[PDB]
Amino acid sequence: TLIVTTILEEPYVMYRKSDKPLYGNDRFEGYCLDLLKELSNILGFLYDVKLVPDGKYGAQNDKGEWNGMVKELIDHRADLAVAPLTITYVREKVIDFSKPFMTLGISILYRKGTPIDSADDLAKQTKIEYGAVRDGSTMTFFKKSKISTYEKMWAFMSSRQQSALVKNSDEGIQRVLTTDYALLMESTSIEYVTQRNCNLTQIGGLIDSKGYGVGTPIGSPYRDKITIAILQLQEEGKLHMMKEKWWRGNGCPS
Amino acid sequence: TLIVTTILEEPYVMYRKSDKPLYGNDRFEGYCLDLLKELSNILGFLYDVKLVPDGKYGAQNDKGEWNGMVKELIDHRADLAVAPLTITYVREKVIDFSKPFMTLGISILYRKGTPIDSADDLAKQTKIEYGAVRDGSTMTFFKKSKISTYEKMWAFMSSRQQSALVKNSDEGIQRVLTTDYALLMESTSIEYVTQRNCNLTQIGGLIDSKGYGVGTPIGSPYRDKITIAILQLQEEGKLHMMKEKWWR
Amino acid sequence: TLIVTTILEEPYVMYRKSDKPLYGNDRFEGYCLDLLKELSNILGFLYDVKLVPDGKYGAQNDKGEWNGMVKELIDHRADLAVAPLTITYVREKVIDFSKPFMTLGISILYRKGTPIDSADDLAKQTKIEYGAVRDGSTMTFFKKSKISTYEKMWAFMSSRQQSALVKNSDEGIQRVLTTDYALLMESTSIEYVTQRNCNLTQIGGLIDSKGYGVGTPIGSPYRDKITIAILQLQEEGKLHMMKEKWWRGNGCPS
Amino acid sequence: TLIVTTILEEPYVMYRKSDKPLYGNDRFEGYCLDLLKELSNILGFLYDVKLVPDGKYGAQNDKGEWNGMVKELIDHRADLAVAPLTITYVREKVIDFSKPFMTLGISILYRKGTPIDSADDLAKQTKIEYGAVRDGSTMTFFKKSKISTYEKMWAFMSSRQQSALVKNSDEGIQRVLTTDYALLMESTSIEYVTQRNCNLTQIGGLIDSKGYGVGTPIGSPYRDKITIAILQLQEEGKLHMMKEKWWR
Ligand SMILES: N[C@@H](CCC(=O)O)C(=O)O
Numbered sequence A, C: 001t002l003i004v005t006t007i008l009e010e011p012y013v014m015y016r017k018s019d020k021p022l023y024g025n026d027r028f029e030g031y032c033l034d035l036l037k038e039l040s041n042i043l044g045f046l047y048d049v050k051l052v053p054d055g056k057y058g059a060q061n062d063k064g065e066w067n068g069m070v071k072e073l074i075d076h077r078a079d080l081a082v083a084p085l086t087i088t089y090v091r092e093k094v095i096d097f098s099k100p101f102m103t104l105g106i107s108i109l110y111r112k113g114t115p116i117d118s119a120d121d122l123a124k125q126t127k128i129e130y131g132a133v134r135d136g137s138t139m140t141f142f143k144k145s146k147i148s149t150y151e152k153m154w155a156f157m158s159s160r161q162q163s164a165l166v167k168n169s170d171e172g173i174q175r176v177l178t179t180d181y182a183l184l185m186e187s188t189s190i191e192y193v194t195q196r197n198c199n200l201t202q203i204g205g206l207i208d209s210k211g212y213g214v215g216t217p218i219g220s221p222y223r224d225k226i227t228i229a230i231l232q233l234q235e236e237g238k239l240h241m242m243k244e245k246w247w248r249g250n251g252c253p254s
Numbered sequence B, D: 001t002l003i004v005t006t007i008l009e010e011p012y013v014m015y016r017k018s019d020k021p022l023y024g025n026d027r028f029e030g031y032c033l034d035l036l037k038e039l040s041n042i043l044g045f046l047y048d049v050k051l052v053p054d055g056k057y058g059a060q061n062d063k064g065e066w067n068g069m070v071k072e073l074i075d076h077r078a079d080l081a082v083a084p085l086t087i088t089y090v091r092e093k094v095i096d097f098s099k100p101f102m103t104l105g106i107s108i109l110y111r112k113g114t115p116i117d118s119a120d121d122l123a124k125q126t127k128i129e130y131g132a133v134r135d136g137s138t139m140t141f142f143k144k145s146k147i148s149t150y151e152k153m154w155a156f157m158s159s160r161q162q163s164a165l166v167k168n169s170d171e172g173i174q175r176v177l178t179t180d181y182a183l184l185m186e187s188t189s190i191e192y193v194t195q196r197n198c199n200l201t202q203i204g205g206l207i208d209s210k211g212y213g214v215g216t217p218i219g220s221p222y223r224d225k226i227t228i229a230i231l232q233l234q235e236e237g238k239l240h241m242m243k244e245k246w247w248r
């Protein structure tokens, strides 16, 4: 019954590995699939997980058109977007969100051992290239900012958009590992990467503070039910357990 | 024009100190008044600040009846609750909230140098009394919990006719200072209090994670308008500045 | 039989909480205490845990005299030092160390939300006080450094009868929470603190890279044996489990 | 004077490319050769570099005899071993090691674009082959491991004896490049290899944590001197510069 739009993004949504045959929903796994399971059992709904065709989170182009999971909701093509979808004021204008299931902030993924310590440092040089995932909320934060440092950074990433803006986080990560590039990435995803790719680290602190919410078309009769369910899972300690399960690891030596 | 219900709690809402007599909204100062001033400018509304008459945040009795700021919104005696009001699943069933303007978790406030290291420490002893603000979300978190350790804690704090609970955070801070008592208090508040009193400290880390949001009655058109304005204030760095200003 | 010198330092060595009578080794708990049981079982020795009387890790004063746990090993007053004792070149000239049981680097503990991004930022000002634990290896790092940013930091933390230095980590943490002060602290301790004290954070990356080792006096019959045991425990995954056990926690929202 | 045993391994020990022929020590370049030069100047000694004849790191045979670089030291055939030689307890019982000059952990080197994410993914199946460098610490780690996942992986990589265990890292790399195969390799090497070959990637995180040390024969008159030198080189930011240099 319910159509769920989502996007590949480790460890939130990933393709499951099995020698066995996977049917529909079982093709996927991750933090967001476990959350989506909880939600369907608590609220009593059936659902069909569909990956967003353009593989984008969602941004409004200059024409005024949206793409990504946000457009799927606006156009009523999906009933819910269950993904690390960031809650922002530009999106609240066109779709609804549940209270957040996880908090995060934009920060920087880069290599260890360099003199770079802040966005300010990146803004003050051009040797190191830097950017964010195209049509993501990080890119939009930079595009719409009136703060000097971030305007200068947007001017830089914008002029190089074809190299600076990446298709997705996986591409951004490979770019940091193999070229002199820093990715503007959400903190939770940075935490995940840096406990595996031990030559990478977070640079500086968090640039902002926000959260991931389940998206719904404006006025959906599931928004509040979902908000209530998430808030209750939080209070029962089940979201912490989910987080530990997907982020758990041996880490890296210092 | 808009009727705003609120509650006294430092540094969110405090009586402005002055020689001459202050009237109306001018009697109040704090992080939430700055936030409210920002929202009124952005949104273009006038407002009137009224302290909730029963002095409570809001909980439901076993009869199904609410009190505090929550009941003011439910009963349509206020348009907005602009206070350090926690977003909880029990309150979402009766009122609406904007997305959070601040994040926090339940933690423990106690005097320094003692024995206690965490809520588990507290749950297995009775020498140190412990409690929470009556009819606040912290109290309700323990009351509704199915986690054995929190169930044990709720049993201890609700017996003896709830003598372990306090009427408000100030009565809680004074009790922590005058006797062997630990207050289950929200982290943002503990961070303010422990900067102001070197006798006090936070024990353990956070028990949970949640947010404060502006409360409105269900279906209010201001719900989303305020969500957008708060989210923009966050993104422009304005909320961070307000926090710095009030947390010293 | 064996005398083990140690020092209180959360969560490595702490007094156990108990309304009952606690004697001998049972009076203590913590990561180092679990390490110590493993070692006593693997090597088969009996032991008595004894806090270092001066309560210091150990440094050599301008007069030339060692103090702390280091001095206890030199004077054959302790058979082992089991604690978060940093392996350093100055110490290695006077005592022996097992291979590292844990890695770490010096970094900065300060409050969240400021413009300070690195040691460089602190070295160029005076309004923000900064320092380290007196007579520990981080103090000796700044005292012995020939790197100019660090030489400038030593000059500061070292002035006015060393007012910027603290007696222990606890006092340093309080000073950070209650005054405009930044503590130079090892990364493993910062991790523990910042996961409980949500308004505090690590500033910049790691200044250096080192490890903690079990210390013994030069010529110790248990020297190589202890080293074999640590390496094996590491290989068997036991040290990772001990770390997860003592650092486990809920974390802070973003 | 001093005979230093080593083994070719990028980017620690490699042959310098030159138009004119190169002789003796000048035939080699790399992180480990730079470390050796620094040790030479700190301690004041002359040395000669001789790749270990068998080209192996070290592993004690199914009897009790040692091969490769470990062997060389045991038999006093080499004064030192300056190479990416892993500090392990098995080796600790027959040779001395300095304190580590570099940290790392076993991880997986595979091809990109697959649902394979960890060692658990490799272990629970058998279509994709996986192995390690015959007679290195990685092999020995799986061999001596009592951890269920790793014993099962050693079961597989041993019954697949020939095909699964490779001669050296180059052969392993090649096998990953031209076959459905995942090589178990130390993280520092995978970091190097992957920067220089975009079709290769690290799979999952680190299996363990350990270090590389300069090896010497039991009770060598240079043990303590080398340890102190390496510790001082780190503290003066020099081992860090050598790392940035060879890994770009
Ligand atoms: N969570 C982001 C995607 C990642 C990013 O923008 O950095 C979004 O919802 O657009």
Ligand SMILES: N[C@@H](CCC(=O)O)C(=O)O
Pocket: B057, B058, B084, B085, B086, B132, B133, B135, B136, B137, B138, B139, B184, B185, B186
């Ligand atoms: N913020 C709480 C009040 C304080 C507390 O309960 O700790 C509430 O909304 O009820």
Ligand SMILES: N[C@@H](CCC(=O)O)C(=O)O
Pocket: C057, C058, C084, C085, C086, C087, C132, C133, C135, C136, C137, C138, C139, C184, C185, C186
């Ligand atoms: N671990 C240090 C003490 C703490 C510090 O110096 O930061 C030592 O062995 O001296």
Ligand SMILES: N[C@@H](CCC(=O)O)C(=O)O
Pocket: D057, D058, D084, D085, D086, D132, D133, D135, D136, D137, D138, D139, D184, D185, D186
């Ligand atoms: N560094 C390893 C060789 C490479 C490996 O075993 O993965 C050793 O000393 O044995």
